[PDB]
Amino acid sequence: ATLKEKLIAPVAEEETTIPNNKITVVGVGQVGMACAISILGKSLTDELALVDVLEDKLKGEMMDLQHGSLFLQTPKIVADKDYSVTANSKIVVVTAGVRQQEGESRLNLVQRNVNVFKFIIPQIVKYSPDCIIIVVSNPVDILTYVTWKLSGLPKHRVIGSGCNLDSARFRYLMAEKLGVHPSSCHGWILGEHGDSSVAVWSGVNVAGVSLQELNPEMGTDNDSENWKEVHKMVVESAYEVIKLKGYTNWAIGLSVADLIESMLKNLSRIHPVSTMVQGMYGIENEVFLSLPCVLNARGLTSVINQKLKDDEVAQLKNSADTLWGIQKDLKD
Numbered sequence: 001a002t003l004k005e006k007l008i009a010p011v012a013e014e015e016t017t018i019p020n021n022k023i024t025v026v027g028v029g030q031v032g033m034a035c036a037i038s039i040l041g042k043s044l045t046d047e048l049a050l051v052d053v054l055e056d057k058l059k060g061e062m063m064d065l066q067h068g069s070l071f072l073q074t075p076k077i078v079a080d081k082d083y084s085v086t087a088n089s090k091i092v093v094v095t096a097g098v099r100q101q102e103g104e105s106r107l108n109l110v111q112r113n114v115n116v117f118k119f120i121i122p123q124i125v126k127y128s129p130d131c132i133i134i135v136v137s138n139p140v141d142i143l144t145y146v147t148w149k150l151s152g153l154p155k156h157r158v159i160g161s162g163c164n165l166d167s168a169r170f171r172y173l174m175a176e177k178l179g180v181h182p183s184s185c186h187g188w189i190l191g192e193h194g195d196s197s198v199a200v201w202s203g204v205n206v207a208g209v210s211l212q213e214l215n216p217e218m219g220t221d222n223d224s225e226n227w228k229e230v231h232k233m234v235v236e237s238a239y240e241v242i243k244l245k246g247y248t249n250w251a252i253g254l255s256v257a258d259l260i261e262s263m264l265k266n267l268s269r270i271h272p273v274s275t276m277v278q279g280m281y282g283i284e285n286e287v288f289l290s291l292p293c294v295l296n297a298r299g300l301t302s303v304i305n306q307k308l309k310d311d312e313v314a315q316l317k318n319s320a321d322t323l324w325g326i327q328k329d330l331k332d
């Protein structure tokens with residue numbers, strides 16, 4: 001007999017078991033692995049599944065995480081090119097595909113990554129028909145639209161990581177200038193996770209003190225403090241980090257784990273993530289971009305109607321138009 005047989009006396013009959021809060025990460029690159037480590041570090045899942053086309057890399061990553069199992073609270077970690085390993089996921093994070101080279105627009109990746117997604121998305125829904133999908137691959141807003149169309153899932157189950165990262169960066173820069181913790185500075189970057197994102201100056205506050213009320217020129221070119229530059233630093237951050245280290249991953253890995261925590265803990269916390277915004281702020285096409293949304297175990301259940309300033313509406317409209325310009329020309 002096995003020493004297993006000698007040591008372990010069953011009390012319950014053998015049974016094949018179904019994970020409670022399984023997460024799949026598709027793509028084990030810089031971003032995929034950073035999401036994986038953040039998810040594991042927060043004990044957010046009882047079963048982590050990884051998928052990539054690079055079989056050796058994939059196995060290598062799986063084994064490295066497994067070797068750290070002692071320090072974790074995730075009893076099953078599996079990896080394969082074959083989507084069968086992904087069955088019964090609560091949440092599937094897609095980080096797979098091409099990324100920006102230095103100075104390259106996220107929008108320039110669309111054609112290559114649409115082809116990647118045309119293969120990936122149907123496999124995901126095949127093995128996890130009841131899942132939530134979080135799209136991370138760029139351009140994140142467009143690929144969220146693409147995923148929604150390809151998957152046939154309702155709007156509340158298809159979410160782009162969107163501006164959760166931009167707002168994090170914004171709140172960090174704000175906190176830098178004020179000497180407080182980013183969590184105590186409040187402000188929203190909305191619209192495209194990209195060059196046309198929108199700083200919602202009207203909602204920026206510390207302890208409910210409206211900063212645009214203290215400084216009505218906030219966000220203009222007529223600004224004593226220089227807030228427009230903060231937004232510009234938010235816009236430029238990815239390019240700057242890509243120029244320095246080649247890609248970004250840590251902040252996004254943390255942003256993604258933040259979103260997953262809200263969903264799997266059923267918290268209904270509000271995050272700026274990418275959703276279908278048709279009919280809001282006079283946006284008349286099926287555009288996906290970020291607005292503040294309520295996230296819980298069902299996914300993205302609500303959007304917050306804001307009282308945006310006229311200029312902010314115009315900026316958000318421009319973002320929708322930029323994104324629609326690309327969306328409209330897509331096939332299948």
Ligand SMILES: NC(=O)c1ccc[n+]([C@@H]2O[C@H](COP(=O)([O-])OP(=O)(O)OC[C@H]3O[C@@H](n4cnc5c(N)ncnc54)[C@H](O)[C@@H]3O)[C@@H](O)[C@H]2O)c1
Nearest residue numbers: 027029030031052053096097098099136137138140247252
């Ligand atoms: N949304 C955000 O805020 C944000 C932030 C950073 C990066 N990104 C995007 O995340 C994506 C990943 O970036 P990265 O640095 O991890 O790239 P990377 O090259 O390190 O990793 C990409 C991984 O995707 C895998 N892959 C390619 N085609 C695949 C397919 N058909 N099926 C399964 N896997 C496939 C590749 O083999 C590779 O391992 C890029 O699109 C990048 O622009 C988004």
